[PDB]
């Protein structure tokens, strides 16, 4: 797949029930060397 287009979503809330919706941020992925810190659980909480 060479191209992606975000699909806008419109929520049909009533005027009274209109609510703020959290923004979503899209970040592109590129091969990178990342120093990784692993805890006893092994999950990553810190990196450079």
């Amino acid at each position: 797949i060479k191209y992606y287009s975000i699909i806008p979503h419109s929520i049909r809330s009533i005027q009274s029930d209109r609510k703020a919706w959290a923004a979503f941020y899209v970040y592109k992925l590129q091969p990178l060397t990342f120093l990784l810190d692993f805890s006893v659980d092994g999950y990553i909480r810190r990196a450079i």
Binding site: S10, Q15, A22, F24, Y27, I44
Partner: protein, 80 residues
């Protein structure tokens, strides 16, 4: 071809309005590598209680990125 069931029979699509000024609100968040933001764990193996460099597809540090926000459609009273 997997069946997705019957396609919508509605004669006309719901009207869509784009207002640039209304949607022109920006609150960008930079990627924080120290906060492990955007980090995908390697599928092949797990590392425990160690610090090592790993090469993988990762977002740039301090990258605001592209921000898309969804907003409620125009409605009058209780009717959208």
């Amino acid at each position: 071809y997997v069946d997705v069931g019957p396609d919508s029979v509605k004669s006309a699509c719901i009207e869509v309005d784009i207002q640039q000024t209304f949607f022109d609100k920006t609150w960008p968040r930079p990627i924080d590598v120290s906060k492990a933001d955007g980090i995908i764990y390697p599928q092949g193996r797990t590392y425990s209680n160690i610090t090592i460099t790993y090469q993988g597809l990762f977002p740039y540090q301090g990258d605001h990125g592209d921000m898309y926000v969804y907003s409620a459609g125009h409605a009058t009273g209780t009717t959208p």
